[PDB]
Design a protein around this nucleic acid. Sequence first.
DNA 1: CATAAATCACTGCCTA
DNA 2: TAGGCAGTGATTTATG
Length: 82
Amino acid sequence: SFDCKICGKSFKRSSTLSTHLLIHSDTRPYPCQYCGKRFHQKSDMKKHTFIHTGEKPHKCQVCGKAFSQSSNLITHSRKHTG
DNA sequence: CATAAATCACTGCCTA
DNA sequence: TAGGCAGTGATTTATG
Ligand SMILES: [Zn+2]
Ligand SMILES: [Zn+2]
Ligand SMILES: [Zn+2]
C-alpha cells in the first residue's frame, strides 16, 4: 500500500494517496464558478456548482426529496430504511 | 439526532 | 512500487 510520508496514514490506491498528498500540498485546481470556493476534485466541485445552479440529480422516491450527492442520498435513504 | 453543505477517501481501468 | 482520470460512498463540519 502507499503510505503518506507527512502525517502518517495509508492508501490502498496511489490515487487515494495522491489526493491525500494534495491535502498536505493543499492543491485545489477546481475553483467554484460562483462563490469562488476551491476544491481538489472536479465532481466534488461540480456537486458544488450544482448547490448553486440548484441541480439535485439524486431523487429519493420515498419522500419526494432530492440531493446533489448520492452519499447524502444514501444516508437520506438509510433514514427511510431504518 | 437530523438537515444542508463541506471534505475526505474508496473505487474501476491502464502501463513500465 | 509509482501516477492519472472519472464514478461513488462514508465521513465530518456548521447549524438547528
Ligand atoms: Zn498525510
Ligand atoms: Zn460556489
Ligand atoms: Zn426521502
